[PDB]
Design a protein around this ligand. Structure first.
Ligand SMILES: [Ca+2]
Length: 312
């Protein structure tokens, strides 16, 4: 069985790429499989600001370090990329600029600067947050499309629309679905359909005493109740305690590897992997925004498909 484990254990790659000259970090990854290749969009930070970028499509993770890094002329910070089958169109969702969250569309998601003009996807605000809504994800079932987000404030938020309405502005409304301390429900929410397991998986980034880490929750439906799965820093979904990463304490904002680029955000638990951001634990960053984040890949320990998966 590929059922998600009670106790997670991973092995990690080394840093998978360095930012090209003029950039300090690569962050906040979103990945889709595309024509047999890895297609990764990301935030980046330079000396003074954030932007967004993509890597040239690459077959193997070893390839990521030399893939070409192309900046987007219109920033799409903390992006989400997927294919929306009921419109036969690719979507890139992001924060800031013309609306709290925006969407843009394309027939070919590898045209880094070929996306449509952004339109509003969400125009709400939330209470008790110094950032406002950040770090969206989007995911659908057969009935509805859902937007989940966080706010640096201990809360996870949700809104939805009918499947047949998408895309449109979700609007101004949102609901708190999880609440805890600021540290416990902080950033980088992601939600997935777990293939073959008849369930949904949520991960949320938390600030731990040893580093950033992910906490997991599961639900029976996207409009259902989320209950904690692996929520402690000592036994997290993914963190210093169980990553196998020697180079980074942080296990931070990224994307599980999706089996299917579509709007269901499906993952194959038999092939469970996390594309994350980490940073050198042996240097103290100048500032958070100058932190030297880099991509890394976790692969779950003990998979039946381990060898086939690791060797690609
Ligand atoms: Ca994200």
């Amino acid at each position: 069985s590929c059922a998600l484990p009670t106790t997670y254990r991973w092995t990690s790659s080394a840093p998978l790429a360095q930012p090209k000259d003029g950039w300090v970090s690569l962050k906040d990854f979103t990945h889709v499989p595309y024509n047999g290749q890895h297609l990764v969009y990301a935030s980046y930070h330079d000396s003074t600001k954030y932007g967004s970028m993509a890597f040239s499509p690459f077959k193997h993770w070893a390839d990521m370090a030399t893939a070409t890094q192309t900046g987007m002329t219109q920033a799409a910070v903390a992006p989400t990329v997927f294919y929306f089958t009921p419109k036969k169109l690719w979507f890139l969702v992001s924060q800031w600029g013309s609306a709290p969250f925006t969407y843009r569309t394309s027939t070919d998601p590898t045209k880094v600067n070929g996306w449509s003009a952004p339109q509003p996807l969400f125009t709400g605000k939330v209470a008790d947050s110094g950032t406002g809504p950040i770090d969206q994800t989007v995911i659908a079932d057969d009935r509805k499309v859902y937007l989940f987000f966080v706010a640096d404030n201990g809360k996870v938020y949700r809104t939805s629309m009918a499947i047949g309405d998408f895309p449109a502005n979700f609007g101004t409304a949102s609901e708190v679905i999880l609440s805890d301390t600021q540290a416990k429900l902080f950033e980088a929410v992601q939600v997935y359909t777990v293939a073959g397991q008849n369930q949904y998986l949520m991960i949320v980034e938390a600030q731990g005493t040893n580093g950033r880490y992910f906490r997991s929750f599961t639900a029976n439906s996207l409009d259902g109740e989320w209950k904690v799965q692996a929520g402690s820093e000592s036994a997290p979904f993914a963190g210093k305690a169980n990553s196998g990463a020697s180079w980074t304490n942080d296990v931070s904002h990224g994307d599980l590897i999706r089996s299917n680029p579509d709007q269901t955000m499906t993952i194959d638990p038999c092939r469970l992997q996390l594309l994350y951001q980490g940073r050198d634990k042996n240097k103290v960053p100048s500032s958070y925004d100058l932190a030297p984040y880099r991509p890394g890949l976790l692969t779950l320990y003990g998979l039946g498909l381990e060898q086939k998966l690791i060797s690609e």
